[PDB]
Amino acid sequence: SILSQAEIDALLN
Amino acid sequence: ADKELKFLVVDKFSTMRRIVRNLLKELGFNNVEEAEDGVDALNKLQAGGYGFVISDWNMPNMDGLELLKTIRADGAMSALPVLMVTAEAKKENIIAAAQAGASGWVVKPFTAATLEEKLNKIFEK
């Protein structure tokens, strides 16, 4: 499942 | 952050390293070194002096995850910031990296604004 920058942002940034 | 902060840019592609180096320069950071893979990276890091690491995920010899885990277990560099910059974006990997201690993650292709913001973010955190 591909996460968007925004989504990734929610857990790593 | 300390304008003299030493960065290590890890990516198999010199072009990508160039992009990162240029943006760092944009932010006022010129003390930058480069590495082609996790092994070379680790080699330089262990030699001493680094304050920040920017690395790709999938790499020959030693990948970003191993690099990250090795850094996090080191007696001296355990807290060294590690920013992943890669085409990889699968939930599983984001998780594993998160679990393993990654400081941030930027998906390629990224805008200059994106990288710069994430950078600033980590300095914060």
In B6-124, which ranges are continuous DSSP H helix? Answer: 14-26, 38-47, 64-73, 91-100, 112-123
Residue B89 to residue A12, Cβ atoms within 8 A: no
**Resolution stated for this PDB structure, in Å:** 1.5
On whether the B1-125 domain is CATH 3.30.70.100, my answer is no
In chain A, what residues touch B89 (CB-CB under 8 Å)? 2-4, 8
Q: In what order do the strands lie in the sheet with B32-35?
A: B32-35, B7-10, B52-55, B82-86, B104-107
Instruction: Judge whether B100 is closer than 8 Å to chain A, CB to CB.
Output: no
Method for structure elucidation:
X-ray
Continuous segment of H or E residues that includes residue A9:
helix A5-12
Number of residues written out for chain B: 125
- For chain B, the domains span 1-125
3-state helix, strand, coil in chain B (%, to 5): 45, 20, 40
- Give bridge partners of residue B90 from the DSSP assignment: A2
Eight-state DSSP code of residue B106: E
Instruction: Judge whether B97 is closer than 8 Å to chain A, CB to CB.
Output: yes
